[PDB]
Every structure is written in structure tokens, then in C-alpha cells.
Amino acid sequence: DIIIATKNGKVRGMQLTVFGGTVTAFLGIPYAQPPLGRLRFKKPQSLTKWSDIWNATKYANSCCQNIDQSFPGFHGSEMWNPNTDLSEDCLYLNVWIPAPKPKNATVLIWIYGGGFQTGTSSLHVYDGKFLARVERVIVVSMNYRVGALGFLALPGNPEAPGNMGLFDQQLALQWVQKNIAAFGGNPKSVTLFGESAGAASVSLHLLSPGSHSLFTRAILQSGSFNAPWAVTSLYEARNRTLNLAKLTGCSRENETEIIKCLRNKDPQEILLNEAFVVPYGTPLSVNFGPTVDGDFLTDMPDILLELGQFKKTQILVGVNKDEGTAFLVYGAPGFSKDNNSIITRKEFQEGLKIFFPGVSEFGKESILFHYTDWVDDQRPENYREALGDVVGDYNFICPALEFTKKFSEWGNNAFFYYFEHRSSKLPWPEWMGVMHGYEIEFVFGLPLERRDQYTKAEEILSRSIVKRWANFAKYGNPQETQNQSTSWPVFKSTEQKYLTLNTESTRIMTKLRAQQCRFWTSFFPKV
Ligand SMILES: O=C(NCCc1c[nH]c2ccccc12)c1ccc(CN2CCC[C@H](C(=O)NCCCNc3c4c(nc5ccccc35)CCCC4)C2)cc1
Ligand SMILES: *[C@@H]1O[C@H](CO[C@@H]2O[C@@H](C)[C@@H](O)[C@@H](O)[C@@H]2O)[C@@H](O[C@@H]2O[C@H](CO)[C@@H](O)[C@H](O)[C@H]2NC(C)=O)[C@H](O)[C@H]1NC(C)=O
Ligand SMILES: *[C@@H]1O[C@H](CO[C@@H]2O[C@@H](C)[C@@H](O)[C@@H](O)[C@@H]2O)[C@@H](O[C@@H]2O[C@H](CO)[C@@H](O)[C@H](O)[C@H]2NC(C)=O)[C@H](O)[C@H]1NC(C)=O
Ligand SMILES: *[C@@H]1O[C@H](CO[C@@H]2O[C@@H](C)[C@@H](O)[C@@H](O)[C@@H]2O)[C@@H](O)[C@H](O)[C@H]1NC(C)=O
Ligand SMILES: CC(=O)N[C@H]1[C@H]([C@H](O)[C@H](O)CO)O[C@@](O)(C(=O)O)C[C@@H]1O
Ligand SMILES: *[C@@H]1O[C@H](CO)[C@@H](O)[C@H](O)[C@H]1NC(C)=O
Ligand SMILES: *[C@@H]1O[C@H](CO)[C@@H](O)[C@H](O)[C@H]1NC(C)=O
Ligand SMILES: *[C@@H]1O[C@H](CO)[C@@H](O)[C@H](O)[C@H]1NC(C)=O
Ligand SMILES: [Cl-]
Ligand SMILES: [Cl-]
Ligand SMILES: [Cl-]
Ligand SMILES: [Cl-]
Ligand SMILES: [Cl-]
Ligand SMILES: [Cl-]
Ligand SMILES: [Cl-]
């Protein structure tokens, strides 16, 4: 029996067998008052003490969210859907600790992605038991509110101030500061890591003064706040809040009366209408996302980044080779996971209208001009590959590179990776390459399990990535010092060195996507 005394009461965990040893898991510890009734849309409220033993032996409810129904029965998409009951009562977190209990272990806190509209910490690819067993770190993950229930915004109005899901994340960081020492963790050695909207979340904790004292270092996988999908303008948020009110019959003049009307709606009615507040949105529209609320976020974050207003610490940032391809089969014409998706010029132009709905004709022509200067005008995959690169460079790679440059210009060590390994088990077709989200299982050490049908080269790759991530968290330096490994240089704004991650040979390269990102970062914001 493993019972830990936390500040709010005792929790009981369970023993897990991992690789011939033991990991202790505490799954589903509450860290806030359930945000129900009058607490819906508010900031998370502090948890009141209990006196029995809370049984932390199963993953808790996932927060309410809409579900991907595009590929029923298909593992490639269903692996991202929630795998526990949906409930507004979802503010829980998980703790994996090594056995025997560590003395002063470094702590890794995972923040999942999902566009701020979906996600849950209980997904199989976020299972922290391998990291705790192999590297003897403590792993923490939390559920935070998503969609309108997490990010509905009436700026300055505490009934729905915005950024509630980010404050959920923050209160869980605070829980770790106050309680992790009882589990054998070091609250002075805490590394946030996350992917996609989780990585954008990590980048916003770097900018939020209220999070400054709650962590040490940060890892950003395939995301950052300056990505075009990651922050909702106050103009959009207000129009989207009022649109949700109209769709649900909750339009009033007293804005507080709107929120009170929205508080009497079943979660399902909110979710169903959430999806329609943005009329001409992109696929996978970030309907309700982070805003400049004057609380969590004190100014437009691009200004904060440019003028050096962020936590001074080390960062690890990276992207995958084919970030853009997954999104093509959620709306681009002519695309399908079940054929090779050779598209025409006309289909490409149609795809740009899908992914750039608010943009002028000239802006879309400029994308076409920069991505259709072919080396060989006859390759039939030209337009298919160009559209994936357009979407991946615009939405992920160029914002990640720009974040890393601007962050490093203020003197801190930054490390950039380019993940280019395609999982041997990938259920998606080959044309989609190295997809958004498919480095996560390597970071969490799933290929270390020899039973799981990964190759030997993938076991070794995951083993090296796990060690580099653990060494970054413990020591601020993502090296693998023992196996004659390529040394990972610091990313500087001048030479812009990065490390490629693959099964063949890791290489030091410079100036990833230099020509493309000059287009997206310097020219396209003007259109
Ligand atoms: O994550 C989002 N947005 C990123 C930024 C971005 C936004 N719009 C873009 C347009 C272009 C480029 C970027 C963007 C996102 C996620 C869900 C929603 C809301 N849902 C609700 C259910 C119905 C519909 C849907 O079908 N959702 C599919 C679930 C996603 N599941 C996958 C995840 C990963 N990898 C996958 C790989 C293959 C297939 C599915 C993958 C990794 C991170 C975790 C989720 C919309 C909105 C935005
Ligand atoms: C656990 O270790 C900390 C020190 O952690 C190290 O330094 C952190 C800043 C982190 O970034 C990592 O590099 C390391 O894990 C101990 O903190 C010390 O606490 C004493 C209290 O008397 C204080 O006087 C020292 O200044 C602290 N040292 C540092 C470096 O901040 C802490 O005491 C350790 N706790 C246990 C139970 O072992
Ligand atoms: C690849 O498939 C897409 C999608 O078509 C669907 O999926 C296929 C696997 C097959 O089951 C079809 O019957 C399905 O309709 C094809 O795109 C469609 O092309 C038709 C032209 O006949 C057009 O009217 C549809 O609107 C297209 N659908 C979409 C979503 O764009 C595409 O032509 C196929 N490409 C190749 C190279 O085979
Ligand atoms: C919490 O759990 C208590 C103990 O659970 C039992 O004992 C341990 C050793 C495990 O083997 C577990 O599988 C067993 O079921 C219960 O006695 C207690 O009732 C539980 N409390 C609640 C509220 O569920
Ligand atoms: C409310 C909810 O979503 N899930 C609850 C489930 C289900 O009500 C039942 O399993 C029936 O489906 O019951 C519990 O007692 C359990 O066994 O974990 C508590 C848990 O919170
Ligand atoms: C929000 O903006 C769209 C497009 O500009 C418009 O059609 C809609 O009526 C607006 N909603 C409100 C509540 O004004
Ligand atoms: C709206 O209602 C709340 C509570 O019912 C009240 O405090 C407030 O004064 C009303 N008017 C405005 C403009 O907020
Ligand atoms: C280093 O190589 C040895 C085999 O020579 C292997 O057992 C070990 O897991 C490797 N370590 C890392 C961190 O890759
Ligand atoms: Cl209530
Ligand atoms: Cl309700
Ligand atoms: Cl052509
Ligand atoms: Cl390797
Ligand atoms: Cl160079
Ligand atoms: Cl350059
Ligand atoms: Cl240019």
C-alpha cells in the first residue's frame, strides 16, 4: 500500500510493473473544485481538504469536448479521441513516480494538445510510466477545460473572463509546487513539456508572470503561441461569444445575464453550437482559444516576445518533417487517406481557399507563387506535396523557428530539433510522411516496450530521445553523453543550428526552411 499525505488529504496509488521493475501511479487526483453550476466559465477555485483516503487508481473524467467522427473505426484518428467519460467534473491530474520512491527527483509536467478544443491526459501515448521507470523522473499530467467551457471570453468579466483552461493548467502547476515533495519530487526542478496546443500553452506560461515561479524549464513540441491558430483576437472572441449566445437563445444586453443563461444549458447544447460560431473558419477551427485577458496574458504576446518580457530560462523546441499532411484529409478537396491523393493545380488552389479563408486573392496567389516553382514540372505529386508543406510551414514550422530565434536573442540557451522518423506502425498512408503528433510516442518511450512491434532501430531512437529530454529537464542540456552521440549545439539567431532526429544518423544542420519562413514570417503577415 502506497499512501501519500498531500496538503488537502491522503491519496492512495497503485503499483505498476514496467520493464522488470515497479512504478507507482496516482491517477485522477483532484486539484480544483469541480467547475459546475455557478462555477462554469469561471477561473478554477481552490480545493477544500478531505479526510478519507482518495483512491487515485484510475484515470479521471476527461473534460467535455466534441469528438472526431471523420474516420470511425480507424486507429490513426481514434487514438486522439477521449478514452474516459466526458464530464465538466474533469479537473484532475496524474502522478507517476519511480519505485523505490525517489529522494529529490526532477519533475516533467505534460500539457496535451488538441487545438484548445479537445484532448485528455489519459491517452495511451501520454502514459508517463515508462519515463518514470527508465529515467527515474516524476511525470505529472493534468486535464484542463477546452472549447467554450475552457476559453469563452468576455474580457474583464469574472463570470467568463477567458483563459480558464490556462488557469486550470496553472493551478495544477501550483499543486505540484505545494505537494510534489511529498511524492519525492523536487519543486525546484520542474520542466513543462507539451505538443501542439500543449506546446503553445507551454510558451504562454513562459510569458505569464503568474506561472514564472511554478516551473524551471520548457519543452515545445510542434507548437508555440505565435502560430496563427493559437491566440484568438479580442474581436473574434467577442463575436464568437455573442454567436454562441444567439445559437443557444441566450442573447441579452447585460453581458452577465448572457453567462447566467449559458450556465443553464446542458454541456451537450454548448458543444453542438460551439462548432458554428466561426462561419468561414479553417478545418479544425480553434473556435475558443487563449485571449489577451489582462490577467494570465497582460498584453498581445507578440509584443511580449519581441521586447523580451518572458521567463529567462532554457528551452527545447522542435517540429516534425510533415506537420501539415494530417490536416489535408479534414477538408482539402481531392485528398484521402485511402489513395495517394495526387491533386491538380485547381485542387491546390481550392485547398488554399480552405486553409486561408480570410485571405485576399493576392495573398493566396502569393502562396502559390512561392510553393509551385518546381525543380521538375512533371512530378505528379508536386501539388499534393506543396499543399502539405504550405500548411505545415505556415501553422507550425515557421512560427516555432521564429519563437526560438526571438527567445534566444535575449541570451538564453535554446535547442531546436527536426524530427524526421516515420513510425513503422503508422496506420496513415505513406504520402503523409512524418505526421503531426507522431513524435509523442517516442518521447514517452513506448517503443522501449519490445512487445509493441516497433523495430530495434526505433527502440534505440526512443531510448536516445528519452535520455536527451530527461537530461534537458534535469540539467538544461539535451545531450546523450555516453554512446558517442552527436552533440546538440545551442540554437543561435546567427547560425541557427538544429539537430535532426531519425533512426539512421542524427545530423547538425542550419537554417531550417530558410526560404519558406522568410515568406511566411516577413512577407505574408503584410497581406
Ligand atoms: O489540434 C487541433 N488543431 C491544431 C491547430 C490547427 C487548427 N486548425 C488547423 C488547420 C491547419 C493546420 C493546423 C491547424 C484541433 C483539434 C480538434 C479541434 C476540434 N475538433 C473537434 C472534433 C471534430 C473536428 C476534428 O476532426 N478534430 C480532429 C482531432 C485532432 N486529432 C489529432 C491530433 C494530433 N494529430 C493528429 C494527426 C492525424 C489526425 C488527427 C490528429 C496531435 C495533437 C492532438 C490532436 C474538430 C480543433 C482543432
Ligand atoms: C532538492 O534539491 C534542491 C536543489 O535543486 C537543485 O537546484 C534547483 C535550482 C534545480 O534547478 C536543479 O538544478 C537541482 O535539483 C534543494 O534546494 C536547496 O534547499 C536549501 C534549503 O535549506 C537551500 O539552502 C539551497 O539554496 C537549495 N539549493 C538550490 C540549488 O536551490 C533541496 O533542499 C533538495 N531537497 C531535498 C529534500 O533533497
Ligand atoms: C482519392 O479519393 C478522393 C476521395 O474520394 C472518396 O474516397 C475514395 C477513397 C473513394 O472511396 C471515392 O469513392 C470517395 O468519393 C477522391 O476525391 C473525389 O473525387 C471526386 C471525383 O470523382 C470528386 O467529385 C469528389 O468531390 C472528391 N472528394 C473529395 C473529398 O475531394 C480523389 O479523386 C481520389 N484520388 C485518387 C488519385 O484516386
Ligand atoms: C479505496 O480503496 C480501498 C482499498 O482498495 C482495496 O485494497 C487495495 C490494497 C487494492 O488491492 C484495491 O484493488 C482494493 O480494492 C477500499 O477499501 C476503499 O473502499 C476505497 N474507497 C473508495 C471510496 O472507493
Ligand atoms: C460519473 C462518471 O462519469 N463515472 C463514475 C462511474 C460510473 O458512474 C459507473 O462506472 C457507471 O458507468 O462510477 C464510479 O463509481 C467508478 O466506478 O469509477 C465513479 C465514476 O466517477
Ligand atoms: C460575427 O461576424 C460574422 C462575420 O463578420 C457575422 O456574420 C455575424 O453576424 C457576427 N456576429 C455578431 C453577433 O455580430
Ligand atoms: C447585470 O446584472 C448583474 C447581476 O444581476 C448586476 O450586478 C449588474 O449591475 C447588471 N448590469 C450590468 C450593466 O452589468
Ligand atoms: C547506450 O548503448 C547501450 C548499449 O551499448 C544501451 O544499452 C543503452 O540503453 C544506450 N543508452 C542510451 C541513453 O541510448
Ligand atoms: Cl451551483
Ligand atoms: Cl447544466
Ligand atoms: Cl504545373
Ligand atoms: Cl538514435
Ligand atoms: Cl549555414
Ligand atoms: Cl537567414
Ligand atoms: Cl520572399
> Domains (ranges, CATH) in the chain?
3-326+393-516 (3.40.50.1820)
The residues near 268 (Cβ < 8 Å, ≥ 6 apart) are none
C-alpha cell at position 467? 535520455
Contact present, 201 and 224 (Cβ < 8 Å): no
Q: Is 502 helix (H, G, I), strand (E, B) or coil?
A: coil
Contact present, 247 and 273 (Cβ < 8 Å): yes
| Count of Cβ atoms closer than 10 Å to residue 136 Cβ | 17
Backbone angles phi, psi at 293, to 5 degrees: -95, -5
Q: 114 among the known binding-site residues? A: yes
Choose the residue to mutate in 66, 68, 145 for probing ligand 1, maximizing ligand atoms within 8 Å of C-beta: 68
Whole-number Cα distances in Å, 297 to 163, 314, 351: 9, 21, 34
Query: CA-to-CA distance for 306 and 403, rounded, in angstroms?
Result: 9
C-alpha cell at position 112? 496535451
CA-proximal residue: ligand 6, atom 1 (nearest): 239
The residues near 55 (Cβ < 8 Å, ≥ 6 apart) are 11, 12
| Count of Cβ atoms closer than 10 Å to residue 280 Cβ | 8
Query: CA-to-CA distance for 74 and 64, rounded, in angstroms?
Result: 22
Q: 436 among the known binding-site residues? A: yes
What's 103's DSSP letter? S
Q: Using a 6 Å cutoff on CB, does residue 189 contact ligand 2? A: yes
Choose the residue to mutate in 157, 255, 257 for probing ligand 7, maximizing ligand atoms within 8 Å of C-beta: 257
How open is the CA angle 116-33-138, to the nearest 5 degrees? 65
Q: List the one residue out of 226, 524, 523, 231 whose CA is nearest residue 403.
A: 226
| Count of Cβ atoms closer than 10 Å to residue 392 Cβ | 28
Helices 234-247/267-274 angle, 10° precision: 120
C-alpha cell at position 246? 444567439
Residue ranges near ligand 9 (ion) with Cβ within 5 Å: 37-38
How open is the CA angle 19-219-518, to the nearest 5 degrees? 135
* CA of 256 relative to ligand 7 center, distance in Å: 6
The residues near 487 (Cβ < 8 Å, ≥ 6 apart) are 479
* Residue corresponding to grid cell 537530461: 471
Helices 382-392/361-371 angle, 10° precision: 120
Contact present, 117 and 65 (Cβ < 8 Å): yes
In angstroms and rounded to an integer, the radius of gyration of the C-alpha atoms of the chain is 22
Whole-number Cα distances in Å, 10 to 24, 26, 140, 143: 15, 11, 17, 20
Query: CA-to-CA distance for 461 and 456, rounded, in angstroms?
Result: 9
Q: Is 183 helix (H, G, I), strand (E, B) or coil?
A: helix
Q: List the one residue out of 392, 386, 385, 377 whose CA is nearest residue 340.
A: 385
Query: CA-to-CA distance for 156 and 316, rounded, in angstroms?
Result: 34
* CA of 498 relative to ligand 15 center, distance in Å: 23
Atom of ligand 8 nearest to the CA of 482: 1
What's 248's DSSP letter? T
Whole-number Cα distances in Å, 55 to 72, 107, 251, 261: 34, 22, 43, 36
Helices (DSSP H) in 180-324: which residue ranges? 197-207, 234-247, 255-262, 267-274, 301-306
Choose the residue to mutate in 57, 64, 85, 91 for probing ligand 5, maximizing ligand atoms within 8 Å of C-beta: 85
Query: CA-to-CA distance for 395 and 398, rounded, in angstroms?
Result: 7
Contact present, 205 and 217 (Cβ < 8 Å): no
Q: 80 among the known binding-site residues? A: yes
Contact present, 117 and 146 (Cβ < 8 Å): yes
What's 486's DSSP letter? P
* Residue corresponding to grid cell 515568406: 519
How does 57-77 read in b/e, with b if 16+ C-beta sit within 10 Å?
A: eebbbbbbbbebeebeeeebb
Contact present, 438 and 424 (Cβ < 8 Å): no
Helices (DSSP H) in 218-373: which residue ranges? 234-247, 255-262, 267-274, 301-306, 325-328, 345-355, 361-371
Whole-number Cα distances in Å, 449 to 257, 454, 458: 54, 8, 10
Between β-strands 3-6 and 414-419, what pairing exists: parallel, antiparallel or unpaired?
unpaired
Contact present, 403 and 388 (Cβ < 8 Å): no
* Residue corresponding to grid cell 510558451: 203
Annotated active-site positions, please? 196, 323, 436
Atom of ligand 8 nearest to the CA of 460: 14
What's 160's DSSP letter? S
**Nearest ligand to the C-alpha of residue 241?**
6
**Nearest ligand to the C-alpha of residue 494?**
14
The whole-angstrom distance between residue 442's C-alpha and the CA centroid of its chain comes to 15
C-alpha cell at position 116? 484548445
Between β-strands 185-195 and 217-221, what pairing exists: parallel, antiparallel or unpaired?
parallel
| Count of Cβ atoms closer than 10 Å to residue 479 Cβ | 15
Reported as half-sphere exposure (CB side, CA atoms, 13 A), residue 187 has a value of 15
Helices (DSSP H) in 343-455: which residue ranges? 345-355, 361-371, 382-392, 398-408, 440-443
Backbone angles phi, psi at 324, to 5 degrees: -80, -20
Contact present, 95 and 25 (Cβ < 8 Å): yes
Q: List the one residue out of 82, 74, 87, 80 whose CA is nearest residue 30.
A: 87
Whole-number Cα distances in Å, 405 to 212, 476, 491: 21, 18, 8
| Count of Cβ atoms closer than 10 Å to residue 102 Cβ | 17
Q: Is 434 helix (H, G, I), strand (E, B) or coil?
A: coil
C-alpha cell at position 491? 540554437
Residues listed for the chain: 527
Reported as half-sphere exposure (CB side, CA atoms, 13 A), residue 78 has a value of 8
| Count of Cβ atoms closer than 10 Å to residue 515 Cβ | 9
The residue type found at 337 is K
| Count of Cβ atoms closer than 10 Å to residue 213 Cβ | 11
CA-proximal residue: ligand 1, atom 18 (nearest): 284
What are the pocket residues of ligand 3 if the criterion is a CB atom closer than 6 Å to any ligand atom? 333-334, 336, 338-342
The residue type found at 453 is Q
CA-proximal residue: ligand 5, atom 16 (nearest): 58
Reported as half-sphere exposure (CB side, CA atoms, 13 A), residue 8 has a value of 16
Element at 175 (helix H, strand E): helix 164-179
CA-proximal residue: ligand 6, atom 14 (nearest): 239
